[PDB]
């Protein structure tokens, strides 16, 4: 501000928003989708 209270108290990082969605959902993913062939 610098006044008042607060002074007292592409990129891959941009792509990480979509990448972190892959961390908790469906991995990447290859091996699992590759296993879906012979399952059914």
Partner 1 sequence: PPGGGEQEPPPPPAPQDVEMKEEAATGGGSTGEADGKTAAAAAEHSQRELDTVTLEDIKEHVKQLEKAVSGKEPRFVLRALRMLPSTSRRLNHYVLYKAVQGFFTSNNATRDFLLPFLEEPMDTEADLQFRPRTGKAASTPLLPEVEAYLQLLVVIFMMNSKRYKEAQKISDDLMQKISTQNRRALDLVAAKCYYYHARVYEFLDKLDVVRSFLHARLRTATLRHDADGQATLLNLLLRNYLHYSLYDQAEKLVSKSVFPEQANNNEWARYLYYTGRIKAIQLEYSEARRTMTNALRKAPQHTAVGFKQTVHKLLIVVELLLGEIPDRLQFRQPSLKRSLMPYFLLTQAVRTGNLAKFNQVLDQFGEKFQADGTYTLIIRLRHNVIKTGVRMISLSYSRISLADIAQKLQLDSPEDAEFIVAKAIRDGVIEASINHEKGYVQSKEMIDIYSTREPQLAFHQRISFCLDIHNMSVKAMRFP
> Binding string, 8-37, against partner 1, x = CB under 8 A?
xx---xx-xx--xx--xx------------
Cis amide bond preceding 29, omega within 30: yes
Closer to partner 1 by Cβ: residue 24 or 40? 24
Beta carbon of residue 29, minimum distance to partner 1 (angstroms, whole number):
17
Rg of the chain over Cα atoms, rounded to whole angstroms, equals: 21
**Do 18 and 24 form a contact (C-beta atoms < 8 A)?**
no
CB-nearer residue toward partner 1: 13 or 37: 13
């Amino acid at each position: 501000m610098s006044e008042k209270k607060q002074p007292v108290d592409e990129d891959n990082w941009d792509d990480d928003n979509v990448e972190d969605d892959f961390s908790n959902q469906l991995r990447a993913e290859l091996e699992k989708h590759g296993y879906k062939m012979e399952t059914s």
